[PDB]
Design a binder for these strands. Structure first.
Lengths: 260, 167, 117, 134
RNA sequence: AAACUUUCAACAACGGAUCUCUUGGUUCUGGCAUCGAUGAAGAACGCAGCGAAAUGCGAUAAGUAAUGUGAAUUGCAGAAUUCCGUGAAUCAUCGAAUCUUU
RNA sequence: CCCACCCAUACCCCGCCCUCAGGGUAGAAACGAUGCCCUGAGGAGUAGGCGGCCGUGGAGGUCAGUGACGAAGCCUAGGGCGUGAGCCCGGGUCGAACGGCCUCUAGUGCAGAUCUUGGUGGUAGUAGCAAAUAUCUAGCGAAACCACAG
RNA sequence: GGGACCGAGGACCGCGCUCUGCAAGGAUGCUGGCGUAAUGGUCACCAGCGACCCGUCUUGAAACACGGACCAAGGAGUCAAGGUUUUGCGCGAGUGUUUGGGUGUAAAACCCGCACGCGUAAAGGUGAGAGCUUCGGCGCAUCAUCGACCGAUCCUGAUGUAUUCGGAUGGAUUUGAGUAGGAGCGUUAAGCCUUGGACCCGAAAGAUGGUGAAC
RNA sequence: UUGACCUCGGAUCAGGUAGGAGGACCCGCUGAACUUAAGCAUAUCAAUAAGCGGAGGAAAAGAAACCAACAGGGAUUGCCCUAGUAACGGCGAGUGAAGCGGCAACAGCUCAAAUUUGAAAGCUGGCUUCGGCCCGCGUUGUAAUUUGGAGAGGAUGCUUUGGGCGAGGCUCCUUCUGAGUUCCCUGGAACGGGACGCCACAGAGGGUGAGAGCCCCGUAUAGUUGGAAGCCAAGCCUGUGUAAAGCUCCUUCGACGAGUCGAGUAGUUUGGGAAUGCUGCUCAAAAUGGGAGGUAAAUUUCUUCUAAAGCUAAAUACCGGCCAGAGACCGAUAGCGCACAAGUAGAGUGAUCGAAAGAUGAAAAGCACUUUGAAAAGAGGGUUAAAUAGCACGUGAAAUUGUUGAAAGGGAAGCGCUUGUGACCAGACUUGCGCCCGGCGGAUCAUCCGGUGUUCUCACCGGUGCACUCCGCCGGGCUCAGGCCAG
């Protein structure tokens, strides 16, 4: 409150009495009367530097850097060791960019939650869904008083094409705990790298892959970034006939024998 | 604040306001647009599906793909290429596609009745008495002060006779 | 430049997306009221006044009476069929007249006028 | 997840509305499920409990006890079943407050309005059954 | 010697920290526009079986009527008051009334 | 003047810690190349500068984490780890939640301010019987002052 | 010859030697002891040596002074706006989506039509010099020196000129936040400066509007 | 003498209206000082606070006596940039706009200056059988027509209409709508763990004796029951009067706001001496007029608007009103002064000032009864899972205190290093492997057979048997390796 702590009528007693020079409340017939006020050190006083609403709450990020991060998250999602290093149960998943045919999810084929559950279990996304179901724990701390009572893991992200698959599959995957749905034209970095950790498990549709080819040429002012490294395999760069041929003879071993 | 503290300790009920808006957000009725309006679609998508223009002004942001709603001279005369002192005032003389568009054209192009305005009994009696004395000389009827008290011009009386069918 | 009591006159904008939703719902209400009609009126093309912006053009307030008469649209019918009229503007040249007359006949070519009853 | 903007997922508001509810709202809250036989007979899952119903307690330390509801204490959110009582220090037999969610109604106190309630619930369930079938 | 003083341990006190909780606050957002001489906001006096506080109400006084729901209220005491009923309720709604002194 | 002897954080030899410097380490290593191995020198410190690490409230991710067969808290003439801030375990009490790790965030760490609020003492069963509630003995009973003691 | 203290490292590699193995790039061998206790730890006390009461402030230093009855909880460089330096990042002579529009699973995320802000626009010689080299040389960035061009300034004062306008050639100890093959824009983190209560607590005052009396 | 008109009054005559509250936002009037300029007075603070008057759901402003110098724009309002620019200033402190450009929203109108003059055609009241009758207002002007990027009057020929019901629809309240209380263990209680299921456009939230999608309320989605008031509306009845309206043409006309502009002067205000605006005093206009700008350009050439009358939605503001939904907020010394009797108790003559104070248990089951005695107290005994949870009540720290046990001391205590004594506590390497025989049982053994899944050559089952091989298990035998400390 703007007036909190200092809607008190208090004056300083000065140096006349042998008390600390702090503004004290006037009056002579109350428990409050005679107590100090107007200070962060004082009970029922105003705190130091009161919080204001004109703090910077939002952060402006360049759209190019956001598109770079979204493309990096998409590229990281196609790597399976990153999927298990993030914490996804994909040991029964047949291929890491898990593409299913659109005919399984077109129209009202998945619009019932039982059909969506059956499809998830069939394509190998079952253990990841069951992980989220079994990971439900009560939140440690006061956040339970503030509308956040439970914590659970994140399951597979379903990416679809709303033009070729419709939006009825959104309804069938809504109640399944952990699984999320996102259109291919509006991909979200908060969902592709949850917690800032790369390698989200993604079940695509076929139309999702085709429009994923499509929508990265439609962004104005952005092209897919060129890496500063062509071959990211350092063992291919160093342990290659090209470099090993011009290398001088080694000057020592990995472990040096003590001379004296 | 004191009032809100009072109501919290009071046994008097909390009067809940229904969410009654002043303006409806969806068209209603038995017309063509009401039966084809999707309440879960925006204005631009609905007007795209109709085949109509929603905003006639300049585009103000980017649009979704498939928007389709947010739109000799002898005398040196710049207007002579524009051609196809009195004009018709109460109407215009205008001379695959979505179904709503075709329905709108059909209902706008259908023939209508006219409700031709008739004449009063006293006007018919006046025009009749005017014919019974002069017959066809509309100039003499205009000159007549007794039978034509309002000194109307012979053209007006001829037009009234033609409307009455008394020639 | 904080010499005065600027604390009592700080305006934050946490209601920016809520006001955008309100504006979009107001446009939806305008659409509901004017169901086949566009929510906007037709406005002319005008040239920007100064020498700095003379090269470009923009939307004006309303069509001149001479432009409406040359396009074949009567003055009193024009505000009732979606065209804006401005009695203050003058043409002053044969090149703005031709442009806005072309705009008006283009509007007439794509209009579905319904009978009164 | 709730979608309608009029619904509130606030724990504070929900607890206040529960513990500061009127008597008719408390009647609606103090509801009990029907027995299996009554569920197949009337096609009704649960009904608000009332004095005169014969119930069986299915939870708590007084499980498998049956009896007639002799009191519906809405203020204390509890019902008082017949012969499910206690003993005070003095020896008085006080009733034991059992929540209506812990019992199953084996016999209804059938009046005209209760039959109307059963008919309305059955009509809604069967019309949704028709909607599901086709 | 005994008594006193100091330190440590167990138990018992004093006191209310810590932990956990929360029908409270605080900040933001959205819909809506409604006090009064037809007597307002505020002040006072009264109304219940036991009412101390709070709340409700005005000599029709913890309220009357009308509508809806459908079997209570409840701390104790009382009712031959109501349960296939124009009908309980410290019920909800609320369009009719009563509405002391200022 | 001569001889022997005594001991500084000084000098010499060895061990260990840290810092700095030099060297080695890929058709990869028998250890996160932000890792490992070898060698040498050095170590006072106010204002001040830089780095690392510990702890607290809350947020995202994760540990398929702990938990009414007992979470958190508290007590403890118990057992360990760390140079240290701290951390882990045992015993008792207790009764519903809590913790680690990677990031994010802040109203984030006290011995003092004649500091604020609360509680509790010596003075002291003393001075005195005073507002409130000329002596001895019952009952009632403060205040100034107080780093620890003469 | 007698004594004390120490045993760092952990397959081999080396220097060597008295060369069937050695005292040569750091300790092994033998014997004995160890569970009703080997060995530790805590508290209390005694004993030998050592040791001015903590924080603040002043002084060359002391000495004074200030604060400290005790315990628990609270308690002080914060948040904005505007400059500036440096680290990371994206794009780059361009850069900045978020005023707004569209869209949405709805304060999120996703997209962008015209503007606008800031910035850019409106190659010489010689000598060093990293690096490369066919061994002859080629030479980054940067610096020194000699030169070139321009806004403008100092004279000489062309063809010409509407006849009162203009500056061609040759000369100057010229300048510049000038050119001489762009570096900026946006964001993040840290530090500093200015203004807001501004690290926290601490006057006498002054003003506005009220409440009472009584000299 | 009588009756008008005008003017000024009375009436407990009839019908109305104002006052107060609230005041977050809004429109006016009035109006400081501290402070900064390391002093201070111009300046700043600030055209702010306090004070006074007046409204609403918004208010205000608003359809150019505007901006501009353009190839022009076109009521008002607000956002972005313009721009910390122009301008002004002890040229210091500093103060500080606007046009254009992009956007949100857009909507235009009513009078006065005219003669209806072939007809005051207009209106407030009263009486009513509700259908039309009286008095009055008004000619010192009430209707119609017209409002200067206009208009009127004639002529002309086309093109336009007005009322009343109204099915039904939208908005909002309402009724109803999925699935385990299956089995076992722990526990006072399953809402915990294990097993087997089901629902899901519903796995938001709350309750229930502990973490509940399926026990209950609700939640999601389309419907569906009944109702309230507005608005829209398919259609169905009627219309009417030589009634109203738009445009065109022209040998006819075309009225536009005065103690107001402006000049002088004094204050006040602004970035603003064409005084930036306003106000007070003195003087006091015009009609091819007046206002404001552009321009050295040859004289004020040109450009652009009409003041002194008025109305008007939207985009905009909002600490208040009726609600609603939320948060990386606070968690009882915090968060509002107030989670609870809170503007309460209490203090002051008064204006005013203004606290402290939450938690038994799942359920009062709130301790019957016996026995001491005068207590807000005990001992037995009882309830409870628990009473060392007993309305001093969850947990229960420290300061400080009492009982018991041990040790030490009487010219300070406390601390650092190092042994000793007493008491108490802990308990060292968690202490193994390999060979050689005999018996037994399995296999990865059998080029044995059959089947399943696969990364298609690897795994997993079922049945056979011990010739070989390899594992284990049991009974004997042997060797070795082992933690610490001393000499």
């Amino acid at each position: 409150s703007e007036k909190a702590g200092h809607q008190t009528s208090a004056e300083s007693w000065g140096t006349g009495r042998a008390v600390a020079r702090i503004p004290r409340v006037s009056g002579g017939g109350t428990h409050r009367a005679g107590q100090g006020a107007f200070g962060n050190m004082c009970r029922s006083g105003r705190m130091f530097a009161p919080t204001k609403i004109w703090r910077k709450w939002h952060v402006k990020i360049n759209q190019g850097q956001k598109r770079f991060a979204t493309a990096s998250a998409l590229a990281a999602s196609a790597v399976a060791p990153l999927l298990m290093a993030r914490g996804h149960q994909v040991s029964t998943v047949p291929e890491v960019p898990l593409v299913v045919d659109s005919a399984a999810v077109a129209g009202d084929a998945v619009a019932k939650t039982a059909a969506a559950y059956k499809l998830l279990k069939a394509i190998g996304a079952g253990p990841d869904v069951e992980k989220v179901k079994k990971s439900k724990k009560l939140r440690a701390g006061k956040g339970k008083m503030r509308g956040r009572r439970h914590r659970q893991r994140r399951g597979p992200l379903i990416v679809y094409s709303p033009e070729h698959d419709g939006k009825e599959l959104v309804k069938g995957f809504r109640n399944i705990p952990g699984v999320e749905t996102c259109p291919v034209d509006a991909l979200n970095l908060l969902q592709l790298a949850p917690g800032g950790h790369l390698g989200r498990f993604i079940v695509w549709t076929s139309a999702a892959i085709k429009q994923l080819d499509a929508v990265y040429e439609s962004k104005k002012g952005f092209f897919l970034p060129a890496n500063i490294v062509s071959q990211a395999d350092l063992s291919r760069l160093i342990n290659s006939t090209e470099i090993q041929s011009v290398l001088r003879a080694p000057k020592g071993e990995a472990r040096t024998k003590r001379a004296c | 604040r004191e009032l809100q503290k009072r109501k919290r300790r009071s046994s008097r009920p909390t009067i809940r306001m229904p969410n009654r808006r002043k303006k409806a957000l969806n068209p209603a009725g038995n017309n063509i647009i009401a039966k084809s309006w999707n309440k879960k679609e925006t204005l631009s998508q609905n007007y795209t599906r109709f085949g109509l223009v929603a905003k006639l002004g300049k585009a103000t942001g980017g649009t979704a793909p498939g928007n389709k709603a947010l739109l000799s001279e002898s005398d040196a005369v710049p207007q002579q290429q524009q051609q196809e002192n009195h004009i018709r005032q109460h109407d215009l003389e205008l001379e695959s596609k979505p179904e709503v568009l075709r329905a709108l054209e059909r209902e706008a192009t259908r023939p209508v009745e006219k409700t031709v305005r008739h004449q009063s009994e006293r006007e018919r009696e006046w025009l009749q008495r005017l014919v019974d004395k002069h017959g066809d000389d509309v100039a003499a009827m205009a000159r007549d002060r007794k039978l034509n008290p309002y000194q109307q011009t012979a053209s007006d009386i001829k037009r009234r006779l033609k409307k009455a069918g008394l020639l | 430049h904080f010499r005065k009591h600027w604390q009592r006159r700080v305006r934050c904008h946490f209601d920016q997306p809520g006001k955008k939703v309100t504006r979009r719902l107001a446009r939806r209400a305008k659409a509901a009221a004017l169901a086949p009609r566009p929510v906007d009126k037709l406005r002319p093309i005008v040239r920007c006044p100064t020498v700095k912006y003379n090269r470009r053009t923009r939307l004006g307030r309303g069509f001149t009476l001479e432009e409406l008469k040359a396009a074949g649209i009567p003055r009193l019918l024009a505000p009732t069929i979606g065209i804006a009229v401005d009695h203050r503007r003058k043409n002053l040249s044969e090149e703005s007249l031709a442009a806005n007359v072309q705009r008006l006949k283009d509007y007439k070519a794509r209009l579905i006028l319904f009978p009164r009853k | 997840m709730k979608v309608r903007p009029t619904v509130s997922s606030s724990r504070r508001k929900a607890r206040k509305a529960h513990f500061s509810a009127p008597s008719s709202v408390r009647r609606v809250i103090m509801s009990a499920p029907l027995s299996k036989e009554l569920r197949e007979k009337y096609n009704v899952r649960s009904i608000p409990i009332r004095k005169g119903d014969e119930v069986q307690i299915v939870r708590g330390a007084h499980k498998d006890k049956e009896g007639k509801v002799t009191s519906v204490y809405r203020l204390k959110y509890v019902i008082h079943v017949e012969r499910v009582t206690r003993e005070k220090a003095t020896g008085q037999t006080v009733p034991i407050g059992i929540h209506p969610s812990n019992v199953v109604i084996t016999k209804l106190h059938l009046d005209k309005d209760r039959e109307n309630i059963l008919a309305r619930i059955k009509a809604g369930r069967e019309q949704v059954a028709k909607a599901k079938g086709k």
